[PDB]
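Budget justification note: compute hours in this period were largely spent on complex prediction jobs such as the one shown. Inputs:
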Amino acid sequence: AGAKDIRSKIASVQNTQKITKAMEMVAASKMRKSQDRMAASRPYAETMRKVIGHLAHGNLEYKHPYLEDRDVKRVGYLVVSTDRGLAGGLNINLFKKLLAEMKTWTDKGVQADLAMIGSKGVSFFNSVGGNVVAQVTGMGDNPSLSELIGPVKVMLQAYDEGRLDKLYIVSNKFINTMSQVPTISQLLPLPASDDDDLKHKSWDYLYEPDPKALLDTLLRRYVESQVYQGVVENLASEQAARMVAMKAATDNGGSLIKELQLVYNKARQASITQELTEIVSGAA
Amino acid sequence: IIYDDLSKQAVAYRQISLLLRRPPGREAFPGDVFYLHSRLLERAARVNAEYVEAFTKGEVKGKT
Amino acid sequence: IIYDDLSKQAVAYRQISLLLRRPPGREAFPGDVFYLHSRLLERAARVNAEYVEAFTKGEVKGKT
Amino acid sequence: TMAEKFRDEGRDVLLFVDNIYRYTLAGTEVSALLGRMPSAVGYQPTLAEEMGVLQERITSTKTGSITSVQAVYVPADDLTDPSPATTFAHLDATVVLSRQIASLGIYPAVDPLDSTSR
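Corresponding output:
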């Protein structure tokens, strides 16, 4: 206490307020860049899904494993997490939703396996003891498809090796700048698209060499593309959440300056009074 | 009874007291600024029937 | 030697000084409260063997 | 006392005081000169009476009225300091001018959100 210590504390809270304002502006720019890199991703997945629709439910159809269900004996999850803190509740809402559904599945007696994108989830699911089978970390704000090939290769290999019976991606969805929501969505076996086989009879492909070999790589590339899209959306969601969290923190700092200043004024007055009384009452 | 500002009474008493050179205390109020309000508000009371009888020379019975 | 709360010796000395009407300094402490503790604590010392031999008139030699 | 003369003539008067804080400070200086004991933050002991004996002479009356517009200055930006605290007990309205509203080129530069009247 004493006016000087409080003036120092007020200086440091004003400094904190400067820092969090800066981080708000930085996140507000990186969010626009992230949601641009998000839009540049759609064409590839959209046209590849049209091709998969043709080869799957067009005038002919194939018995490829990834397209039809089986007995769920265990599940795989691909978990996207942020590499950096100060995002607010983003990671923990997601992990709680994941834990709830993993509990559901383990009640039915089916195990689950986790592949991690991002280091926050890695540390969390190590501390909670989940089964983490593969991971990639430290992508930051330069996500690249070439680094996702590892973990999704692990999970696909384990799928067609029969050791997984369903596969999910758990990630945030950048719905709007003010709202993001954790979603767990299935990507194997392949969801039934809003498509009709009637349109297919118009024409068919010259498959080189043959459709059974092409469809495999199409589905693998498609799953990779969707894991990548989930990662980029999670990144844009992270930027938006950091922006709003730093807004909240800057207002919380500003509303605390005005308490510390009441304390400071009270101490200033008290010291003036005590000193001047100790002078005048010592005289004579 | 409603004392409209007992802050302004304390200020007026602090003035009367500093003009008589009495050593002030915390916030420059005199030493006995507690006793000032204490002997005042301690008069707001409820008195029993025997006190009313004794005070009023027996005119009033059984009222508090 | 362990002096338990010199900060209470200073207060007893303040009382004595203010009752003898000596001029108060800061926090009403007398001016010479530094010279009070100073000449107390400067008795803690380590004294060389020659001082001991002088003091004990040669009865104790070679010990500090 | 000149405004009071205009009031006695039945008129409505308007009295500007260019800084009431300096009236308080002149009171403190004179009080120190006379040798009276210092009060709450160094202010004279008679602070609230010295203010009230001024602020109480300017009121409406069955024959006239004096309104007043008083420039105020708050030491250390502290609205708790005894001088602001004593003056604010007497003010009715309060208009705050703003550098910003003037930078927008809008005049008068009164701030509607901080300006207040009871």
